Design a protein around this ligand. Structure first.
Ligand code: NDP
Ligand code: 11F
Length: 157
């Protein structure tokens, strides 16, 4: 399976100055549950924003840098390399990778953050004309989770 995994706001912001614009522990839990024991594929910049691989899953980084080597990280140098990765593979960011992959994925797991944040990086536009809502689950508001959010699972029609 090839899936997108993304959190974006009401205007499809995903990032600002190499960081997530919001703090939402519930969403990190959602990522952990979905991707543990599977594979994440991310662009070089997304990886460096996090700085280290996420535990208990395969971390694959896409870069043109032939010197790129990080312990606990597998490197690929082409989009075509993604299709040869076994198991459930989640496209994990950022903007460039999403733009390259949105047309190709089976599936999207989107956390819609119901706010308008300042951003410099964006998820590409998409229409529900192309995507069936497999599930839509409201995130629970919390002392630690104070932004309304909805977990969408979208499947290509
Ligand atoms: N939610 C998110 O996903 C988050 C993303 N961001 C940010 O996104 C911002 C914008 O950068 P963006 O480019 O979208 O980030 P990406 O994660 O998509 O990384 C881009 C890099 O990935 C590599 N890459 C992408 N496509 C290819 C390809 N076809 N062939 C070879 N290498 C490829 C290149 O690395 P290289 O230059 O090494 O060759 C490229 O510069 C960054 O500032 C990043 O911090 C910030 C916070 C969160
Ligand atoms: C999982 O940890 C992260 C992941 C990222 C990357 C950019 C991501 C992502 C992502 C999230 C958070 N949610 C969903 N649904 N999809 C994603 N691709 C950025 C910062 C962090 C992070 C780093 C340190 C502390 C807290 C969060």
């Amino acid at each position: 399976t090839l899936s997108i995994l993304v959190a974006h706001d009401l205007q499809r912001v995903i990032g600002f100055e190499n960081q997530l614009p919001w703090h939402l522990p519930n969403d990190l839990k959602h990522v952990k549950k979905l991707s543990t024991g599977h594979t994440l594929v991310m662009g070089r910049k997304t990886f460096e924003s996090i700085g280290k691989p996420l535990p208990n899953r395969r971390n694959v980084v896409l870069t043109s840098d032939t010197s790129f080597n990080v312990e606990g990280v597998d490197v690929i140098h082409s989009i075509e390399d993604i299709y040869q990765l076994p198991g459930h593979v989640f496209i994990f960011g950022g903007q460039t990778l999403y733009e390259e992959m949105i047309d190709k994925v089976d599936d999207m797991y989107i956390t819609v953050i119901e706010g308008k944040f300042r951003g410099d990086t964006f998820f590409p536009p998409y229409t529900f004309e192309d995507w069936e809502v497999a599930s839509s689950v409201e995130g629970k508001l919390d002392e630690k989770n104070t932004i309304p959010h909805t977990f969408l699972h979208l499947i290509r029609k």
